[PDB]
């Protein structure tokens, strides 16, 4: 709210009072945290970027996916996500010890819908499936690049503080196309998670629902590792009350 | 005569709309709906997708059936409108959200919907799963990778920076948005092909979990 | 552009150097001839090589820097009976005229001599030079050709280079001069031009329609030609994917390496088609004696008709519909187990199939 | 031919002649009504001059083009052709703003994800160990 | 016959109130509307305007739809008569006041009222400090000074004081009704013309604050 400073002599009585309205500072602190978080997240974006071209793929992304007979560089993306995902949880992992199987649907009848990729152990080592369709489909739903997304009081404060500056494929698209795939890679690494450190059994009530994944995770995530991708903003949907009626 | 122009971009950004092929959400209004219908009757090259919706008129709870080649038409012709790729399953999924709009009584505010009635028997998510993953253990791997390995991370910090430059005009919170929708609406397509209720709760307990798990 | 007819233009790739044996006194209205003469050069170092002494005709002789006067429009420039006028590559509008004809000498035509009434255009065997491009070579100011003309007509790899502020049109002709001293050159010999990449295109553009002028104008075709950048760098392409050293094969020997398959085969090479589309942005047809027909980018032509058929002349409806491309794109994807990149057009033909 | 000419003249007339009665909810409707009786009015010819008027009301209301009295006594012919009792410009322009609203009207759409924008601090020790170890490495 | 001369004055005195293109405040009476619409009836010159204010005499509420060769004679027409400049914002504001003016009734008092439906959406204050911040802030300047410099105090006295005598004649009641009309007309339009309400009661807390200031 606000607070109030007074200054004066010791050997004098005359004191001076000055009062301080703290939304000054309150703007200053929410600007830097929103300065920080940006330049994190767009850090972890490039990285990935950066290390997808390390794998030097001749194709773009969507390419890639919709180039089903490669199935090796699929499979290489997926495992090269799913490894910086784990590392981003655990800095001083670099690899993925056991190793990895990996099989791309083709079907409805072989997709399960709403997680894309998921994990099933063949009683020696973990698979990954993949549904590659899908992943397609998301990628090459088209983005809104135009349309902006949201107190007024603070939000004008801001406008008249901060300020605004007037040879890569890359357009914001593509970048979106790079954030989803890695939000993706990311719940499923969430399921994958729940499932090595709980069971399969566990992992399969995580699927039917996901709010397991508040307690399994938050004992280990929120404290040592760096929060979710999602943890950016508070997503809802949209009438979601008269939704639920429905 | 018509605007014939701005009747087809109407119809274009509806039809997108509809067929959840961009993420893209601006208000819409009986003025587009008789715009997409009209540039429909009107062109010569869409009068097959002009009837199939104009069928929607009626009760609407019945599949449409085309020769091959009327398929085939139908689709190039949605192809060719959206520039795109596409189905017939896309084709259903504006079907029914044609019918559904038709139907719906002119009101004084917008009609929130789900999709719905894409693809006869109900499925619970529980024999989608167990179905499913029997057909995937079936499934043989098609690749694989050595256990160990190392992730190929880069190592060029100028390119590192340069990349970063060439991202900063990208507003987070337009890509966020843009990302989470485009999984929402996969998601949606997914369930309603398959005929399983979709589970609106657990969707958005997703987010709830990525609260709970910030706020400690 | 207009030109007044007392101006009489010989062009010669030999004016590189000045022709003093070709002047001659004019004579005025009364015939006296006029024994005052004054050449004119595009700049003040050209003044070296006029050799007074080259000139008996005459009793004074002057040599100056042609500029531009603004104040005389080309359309009729000033006369001056007082002396007999010689222009030697000229850069600028003529602004000056001589008693009797004004004589001109140059190695390059540009517009402002185009329209001249009287033009005689001298014909030379061609020889070619050898484009080099490069990071022993011998440094060779341009400006000054004729102060490097022992080294020019002697080594064989040079590196021709300009002082900063020199102009574009100084730039044209030095290249232009040196390029006629290798067209006498026994030996075809390799430079390197030490300047930007569109600049040198754009010198070339320039060089190849002054050529362009030459032809109209009656000159003798040569295929001392040159290559832009683009198209250089395609060629570079092709010969690294063939494993040819850049070093080993040159540019035109590449090109002919197709002339055994143009005929034989009745196709255009590729390598053709692609240097025809760079010249375009900056189609092709030919034949073979007594043949009948004409091998074309479009495929076979009857001799002297135009380069598609009439439109009725073949019905492709048969396979060109969609039904038939859908259904041969879906076997396509099925067969190989495709997703994608995959496209089936239907094929076209013309007079011939 | 695709159009049920019939059958769009039935839904034209019902839709006209209600908003000609009244203007306000009449949640007896559907869009579906709308188009049909919009489609009708551009197959018609005669009916092209209230079509041209409808699609005007697209969008703002904008104003009523000038028609020549005889343009006026066709119109109104073809209302009440269309529909009998008698009419009147009023009742045309009061009927044009009815529909200029019901074109001006929301229709469904699809719910989406909505980002909103969200309070903890971090302790000057933590804070001092990090920046004492950034002077350290400092030159 | 009429005195056109007299109509065309009283036309333009009014035409000048009711687009704020003048300072000047006078009465006005039915008279001088008869005055202004006769003599737009009679003018070949101005026919399209009277026919725009003709038009008023409906609904009113109502975007008249014109070719551009329409507008460029209307707001040629305009220009003519009050001799400047203008916009088809004036076109419409004087639109606007005119359909007021006709529709209201007939009184034995004036109606004071304020600039009002010009230019759909109602938008606040806040939202457009909001939009229009962030564009500005988009936008980059122009030209700058560096720090520091000096204030161009001019130096000759008798200078000053030619200019003070030059300047002894004009009322200071007059300059300052002026500007200060001048200020809210052309604050007022800006409201209208960004479809956002005026906000009368801050106008006036201007002055109640220099009072506040002068009082201490």
Not at chain 1, 195 to 204: A, I
Not at chain 2, 31 to 52: A, Q
Not at chain 4, 122 to 134: P, Q, V
Request: glycine share 2%; hydrophobic share 35%; charged share 25%.
């Amino acid at each position: 709210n606000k607070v109030r400073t007074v200054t004066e002599i010791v050997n004098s009585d005359e004191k001076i009072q000055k009062t301080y309205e703290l939304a000054e500072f309150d703007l200053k602190n929410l600007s830097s945290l929103e300065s920080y978080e940006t330049l994190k997240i767009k850090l972890a974006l490039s990285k990935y970027m950066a290390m997808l071209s390390t794998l030097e793929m001749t194709q773009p992304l969507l390419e890639i996916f919709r180039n089903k007979a490669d199935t090796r560089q699929i499979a290489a993306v997926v495992f090269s996500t799913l490894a910086f995902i784990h590392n981003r949880f655990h800095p001083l992992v670099t690899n993925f010890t056991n190793k990895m199987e990996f099989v791309v649907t083709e079907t409805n009848d072989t997709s399960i819908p709403g997680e894309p990729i998921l994990f099933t152990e063949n009683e020696g080592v973990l698979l990954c499936s993949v549904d590659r369709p899908s992943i397609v489909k998301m990628l090459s739903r088209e983005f809104d690049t135009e349309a902006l997304v949201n107190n007024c009081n603070v939000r004008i404060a801001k406008t008249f503080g901060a300020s605004k500056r007037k040879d890569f494929s890359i357009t914001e698209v593509e970048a979106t196309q790079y954030l989803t795939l890695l939000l993706t890679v990311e719940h499923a690494y969430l399921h994958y998670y729940i499932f090595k450190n709980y069971g399969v059994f566990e992992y399969c009530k995580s699927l039917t629902d996901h709010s397991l994944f508040t307690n399994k995770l938050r004992s280990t995530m929120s404290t040592k590792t760096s929060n979710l991708l999602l943890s950016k903003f508070k997503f809802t949907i949209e009438d979601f009350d008269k939704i639920n009626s429905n | 005569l018509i605007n014939m122009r701005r009747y087809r971009n109407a119809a274009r950004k509806l039809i997108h709309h509809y067929s959840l092929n961009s993420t893209s959400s601006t208000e819409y209004k009986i003025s587009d709906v008789v715009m997409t219908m009209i540039f429909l009757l009107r062109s010569e090259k869409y009068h097959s997708l002009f009837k199939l919706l104009e069928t929607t008129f009626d009760d609407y709870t019945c599949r449409p059936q085309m020769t091959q080649v009327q398929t085939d038409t139908l689709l190039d012709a949605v192809r060719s409108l959206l520039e795109m790729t596409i189905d017939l399953t896309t084709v259903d999924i504006m079907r029914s959200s044609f019918a559904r709009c038709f139907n719906s009584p002119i009101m004084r505010y917008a009609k929130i919907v789900l999709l719905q009635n894409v693809a006869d028997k109900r499925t619970t998510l529980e024999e989608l799963l167990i179905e499913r993953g029997e057909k995937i253990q079936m499934l043989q791997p098609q690749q694989y990778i050595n256990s160990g390995t190392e992730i190929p991370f880069c190592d060029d910090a100028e390119f590192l920076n340069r990349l970063l430059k060439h991202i900063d005009p990208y507003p987070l919170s337009r890509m966020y948005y843009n990302a989470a929708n485009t999984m929402f609406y996969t998601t949606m397509e997914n369930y309603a092909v398959s005929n399983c209720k979709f589970n609106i709760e657990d969707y958005n307990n997703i987010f709830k979990v990525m609260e709970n798990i910030r706020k400690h | 552009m207009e030109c007044p007819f007392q101006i009489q233009v010989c062009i010669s790739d030999r004016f590189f150097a000045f022709p003093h044996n070709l002047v001659e006194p004019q004579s005025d209205v009364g015939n006296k001839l006029i024994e005052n003469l004054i050449v004119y050069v595009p700049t003040d170092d050209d003044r070296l090589y006029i050799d007074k002494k080259q000139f008996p005709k005459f009793n004074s002789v002057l040599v100056y820097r042609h500029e531009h006067d603004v104040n005389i429009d080309s359309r009729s420039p000033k006369k001056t009976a007082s002396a007999t006028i010689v222009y030697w590559n000229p850069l600028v509008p003529i602004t000056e005229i001589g008693a009797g004809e004004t004589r001109v000498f140059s190695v390059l035509l540009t517009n402002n001599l185009f329209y001249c009434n009287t033009m005689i255009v001298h014909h030379e065997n061609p020889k070619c030079p050898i484009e080099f491009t490069y990071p022993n070579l011998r440094p060779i100011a341009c400006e000054i050709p004729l102060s490097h003309f022992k080294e020019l007509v002697e080594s064989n790899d040079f590196l021709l280079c300009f002082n900063l502020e020199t102009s574009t049109m100084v730039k044209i002709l030095s290249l232009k001069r040196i390029f006629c001293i290798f067209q006498y050159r026994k030996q075809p010999a390799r430079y390197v031009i030490n300047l930007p990449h569109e600049e040198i295109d754009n010198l070339y553009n320039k060089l190849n329609w002054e050529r362009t002028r030459r032809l109209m104008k009656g000159d003798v075709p040569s295929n001392c030609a040159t290559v832009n950048r683009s198209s250089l760098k395609y060629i570079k392409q092709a010969q690294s994917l063939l494993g040819i050293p850049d070093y080993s094969q040159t540019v035109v020997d590449f090109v002919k390496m197709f002339q055994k398959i143009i005929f034989p085969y009745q196709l255009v090479p590729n390598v053709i088609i692609k240097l025809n589309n760079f010249d375009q942005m900056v189609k092709i047809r030919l034949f073979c004696k007594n043949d009948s027909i004409a091998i074309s980018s479009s495929g076979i032509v009857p001799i002297n008709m135009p380069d598609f058929s009439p439109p009725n002349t073949f019905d492709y409806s048969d396979y060109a519909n969609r039904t038939n491309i859908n259904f041969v794109t879906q076997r396509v994807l099925t067969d190989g187990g495709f997703s994608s990149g995959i496209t089936v057009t239907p094929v076209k033909y013309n007079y011939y199939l | 031919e695709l159009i049920n000419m019939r059958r769009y003249r039935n839904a034209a007339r019902k839709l006209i002649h209600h908003y000609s009665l009244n203007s306000t909810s009449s949640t007896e409707y559907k869009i579906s009504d709308v188009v049909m009786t919009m489609i009708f009015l551009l197959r018609s010819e005669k009916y092209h001059s209230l079509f041209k008027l409808l699609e005007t009301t697209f969008d703002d209301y904008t104003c009523r083009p000038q028609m020549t009295q005889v343009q006026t006594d066709t119109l109104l012919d073809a209302v009440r052709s269309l529909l009998s009792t008698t009419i009147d410009l009023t009742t045309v322009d009061i009927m044009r703003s009815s529909f200029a609203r019901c074109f001006n009207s929301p229709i469904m759409r699809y719910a989406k994800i909505v980002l909103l924008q969200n309070d903890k601090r971090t302790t000057l020790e933590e804070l001092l160990i990090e920046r004492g170890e950034k002077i350290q490495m400092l030159q």
